[PDB]
Amino acid sequence: DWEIPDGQITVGQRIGTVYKGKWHGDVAVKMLNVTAPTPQQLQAFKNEVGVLRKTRHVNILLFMGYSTKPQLAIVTQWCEGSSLYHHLHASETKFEMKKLIDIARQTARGMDYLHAKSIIHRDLKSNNIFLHEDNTVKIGDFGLATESILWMAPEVIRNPYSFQSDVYAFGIVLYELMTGQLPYSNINNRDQIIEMVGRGSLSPDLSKVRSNCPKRMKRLMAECLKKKRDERPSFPRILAEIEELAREL
Amino acid sequence: DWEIPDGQITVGQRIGSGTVYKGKWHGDVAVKMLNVAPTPQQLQAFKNEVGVLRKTRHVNILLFMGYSTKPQLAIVTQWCEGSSLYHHLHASKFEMKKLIDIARQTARGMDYLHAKSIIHRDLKSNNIFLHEDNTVKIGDFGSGSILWMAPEVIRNPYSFQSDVYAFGIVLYELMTGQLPYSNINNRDQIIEMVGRGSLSPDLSKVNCPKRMKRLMAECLKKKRDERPSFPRILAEIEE
Ligand SMILES: CCN(C)S(=O)(=O)Nc1ccc(F)c(C(=O)c2c[nH]c3ncc(-c4cnc(C5CC5)nc4)cc23)c1F
C-alpha cells in the first residue's frame, strides 16, 4: 500500500491545491479541499494514483503516496527550482545550447518511458516540466494522464488524444527551447489560433530558432509538429535522434 | 509487474563488483547482475528482495526501476552521476554547510526506511552515492566492512539501532574526514576491541555544531538501547 496514514504529514505553505509539506523530509502535497468528494472526484483520484503508481524514472515526478480519509491527497517529492516555463519565458537567465539539448533529452527519456508503459500525458507543456535544482528535468502535473492551447495538436483542437498528441506537445516544448519564445507571437486571440491550427493553415515559425540550433534538432522539431498525426515520430526515434546529435556536438 | 523483458536493456561498462554495469533503458540505468543459472528455489528468494525495494519511493533512496530474470537475475536502478560519499571523503573539501546537508539527507532516507520497517543492515559511506554531488542516494540494502558495525552485530543482532550506529560512524566520517581507528590498522584488533566495548571512535578528530557531536555520540552508544531513533535523529539535525 502507498496509502500514507493521515496525520503523518505536516502541511505547510501554499503554492497554487498544492502545499509544501514535511514527511521524512520535504514533500509536495496536492489536496482536494472539498467537504465530500464527488463520484467524479473519486475516479479522477484513483486514476491519477493508478498511473503514478506505475512510474519509476528519474525524469518523472516521484510519486510517494496518497491520502484518502480526510481529503483526497497525492504526495510527491519536493522539487526545488522553477518550471521550464518560468526559466524560458518569465526569467532573465537564458540557457546555453548544450543545456537546451540536455533539457530536451531528459524530457524525451521521460516521455519515452511513459509511452513504453502505455501512458499518455495529454498535457505536456513547459509549465509541467520542473527543472529540479535547475539541471534535472521532472515531468509532472499528472492531472490528465491515462492508461494549454499552444501545446495542442490540430486533431486535439478539432478520442483526439494519443501518443501522437504527446509528440506534438513535445514538439512545441522543443520550439520553446530552441526559440526561447511561445508559438504564435503574432496572434493574441485564442479563437484565432484554434481555428488556424485546427485547419492546418498555421504552424510554429521555425525561422525563429537560434543560429546555434543544430539542423538535426530543427528537422526533428518539424517532424514532431507534423499536421498529420500519423506522420509524427515515436519517442524511441525521437530519443534516439536527440541522443545522436547530443554526442555529435 | 516491474519486470523488464529480455533485450530491452543495453548493458555497457563494468562499474564495480553481484556485478554493477552502466546501461541504457529509456535513458541511463545501473544494472546489478546477480552472481547466478537460477533454480526455482532461488527465484522466489530473489523476488522477495525485489518486493522490499518495490516499496521504496523516496528522493534520498536510490530509485529502484525494475528487475530482469533473463538472461540472468538483475536489479535495475537509476544511474547516479558522480561518486560515493566514501570517495569524496577519503579520496578527494566540503563546506560544513554541505556536510550537514549530506548528513541531513541520509537521516531522511534512513527515517523513511525505518518507517517502512526496513533495516538497511549495511549503511556506510560507499553505500551513500552523491548524485550530481548534491543529492544523497542510499543503496545496497536489498570478508566485510566492520568499521560501521555496532558492537552487538560483531559478537535480533540486526536492528534499527544497529542502523543508527552505522549512521553514527557516517556522521564521524563527515565530521572528521577520515575512517575510525585509523590509528589502529588491524581488523582483528578492531573486531575484538569494538566487540568488547574497549574501543570507540576518537571524537578528538572532529567547526562542528556541538549538537551534532552530542548526536554523533548518541548514535555511537555501545549500549544498543541508549541510541536515539531516526525520527529524533532527523528532528535534531533538521533543527
Ligand atoms: C535501489 C537500491 N537497490 C535495489 S540495492 O540492490 O539495494 N542497491 C543497488 C542495486 C543496483 C545497483 F546498480 C546499485 C548501484 O551500485 C548503483 C545504482 N546506480 C548507480 N549509479 C552509479 C554507480 C557508480 C558509478 N561509478 C562509480 C565509480 C566512480 C567510478 N561508483 C558507483 C553505482 C550505482 C545499487 F547500489
DSSP for chain A?
Answer: --BPPTTS-EEEEE---EEEEESSSEEEEEEE--SS--HHHHHHHHHHHHHHTT---TTB--EEEEE-SSSEEEEEEPPPS-BHHHHHHS-S----HHHHHHHHHHHHHHHHHHHHTT---S---GGGEEEETTTEEEE---TT----GGG--HHHH----SHHHHHHHHHHHHHHHHHSS-S-SS---HHHHHHHHHHTS----GGGS-TTS-HHHHHHHHHHT-SSGGGSPPHHHHHHHHHHHHHH-
Helix/strand/coil for B201: coil
Going from the Cα of A36 to the center of ligand 1, the distance in angstroms, rounded, reads 45
Residues across chain A: 249
Residues 14-43, chain B, touching A (beta carbon < 8 A): 26-27
β-strand partners of A77: A27
HSE-up of A35 (CA within 13 Å, CB side)? 0
C-alpha cell at A130: 520542473
* Pocket of ligand 1 contains residue B123 by CB under 6 Å: no
Confirm whether residue A68 is marked as ligand binding.
no
C-alpha cell at B178: 577520515
Helix/strand/coil for B198: coil
Domain A81-249 CATH assignment equals 1.10.510.10: yes
Q: Would you call A136 an interface residue with chain B, using a CB distance cutoff of 8 Å?
A: yes
CA nearest to A8 within chain B: B115
B103 contact partners, CB below 8 Å, separation of at least 6:
B170, B171, B174, B212, B237
Whether omega for the bond prior to residue B71 falls within 30 degrees of 0, making it cis, is: yes
Residues across chain B: 239
As for chain A, the residues directly before each break of C–N over 2.5 Å are 16, 147, 158
Q: Would you call A109 an interface residue with chain B, using a CB distance cutoff of 8 Å?
A: yes
Which residues in chain B belong to E strands, given as ranges? 10-16, 19-24, 28-33, 64-68, 74-78, 128-131, 135-138
Q: How far is it, in rounded angstroms, from Cα A59 to Cα A115?
A: 13
Which amino acid would we find at residue B42? Q
Q: Which residues of A touch B58 (CB under 8 A)?
A: 24-25, 62, 64, 77
Is A133 in contact with A80 (CB distance < 8 Å)?
Answer: yes
Helix/strand/coil for B128: strand
Is B163 in contact with B208 (CB distance < 8 Å)?
Answer: no
Mention the CATH class of domain B1-81: alpha beta
Q: Would you call A67 an interface residue with chain B, using a CB distance cutoff of 8 Å?
A: no
Strand order in the sheet with A18-22: A10-14, A18-22, A26-32, A72-77, A63-67
Longest CA pairwise span in chain A (Å): 56
* Pocket of ligand 1 contains residue B80 by CB under 6 Å: yes
For A65-68, which contacts have Cβ atoms below 8 Å and span 24 or more sequence positions? A65/A2, A65/A3, A65/A4, A65/B57, A66/A2, A66/A3, A66/A4, A67/A3, A67/A4, A67/A6, A67/A9, A68/A3
Chain center to CA of B17: 15
CATH 1.10.510.10 domain range(s) in chain A: 81-249
Going from the Cα of B75 to the center of ligand 1, the distance in angstroms, rounded, reads 10
HSE-up of B43 (CA within 13 Å, CB side)? 8
| Residue of B26, B55, B118 to mutate, testing the A interface (most A Cβ within 10 Å of its Cβ) | B26
Is B171 in contact with B102 (CB distance < 8 Å)?
Answer: no
CATH 3.30.200.20 domain range(s) in chain B: 1-81
β-strand partners of B14: B21
Environment class of B48 (CB within 10 Å of its CB; exposed 0-12, middle 13-18, buried 19+): exposed
Q: Which of B26, B115, B132 sits opposite A24 (nearest CB)?
A: B115
Q: How many CB atoms lie within 10 A of CB A45?
A: 18
Going from the Cα of A160 to the center of ligand 1, the distance in angstroms, rounded, reads 41
Distances (CA, A) of A229 to A150, A223, A234: 16, 10, 11
Q: How far is it, in rounded angstroms, from Cα B230 to Cα B235?
A: 8
Name the superfamily (CATH) of residues A1-80: Phosphorylase Kinase; domain 1 (3.30.200.20)
Distances (CA, A) of B97 to B145, B170, B178, B181, B238: 28, 16, 18, 26, 12
Which amino acid would we find at residue A17? T
Confirm whether residue B47 is marked as ligand binding.
no
Longest CA pairwise span in chain B (Å): 55
φ, ψ at A90 (rounded to 5°):
-125, 25
Environment class of A70 (CB within 10 Å of its CB; exposed 0-12, middle 13-18, buried 19+): exposed
State the CATH architecture for B82-239.
Orthogonal Bundle (1.10)
Confirm whether residue A17 is marked as ligand binding.
yes
Q: Would you call A56 an interface residue with chain B, using a CB distance cutoff of 8 Å?
A: yes
C-alpha cell at A168: 506534438
| Residue of A9, A27, A55, A58 to mutate, testing the B interface (most B Cβ within 10 Å of its Cβ) | A58
As for chain B, the residues directly before each break of C–N over 2.5 Å are 17, 36, 92, 142, 155, 206
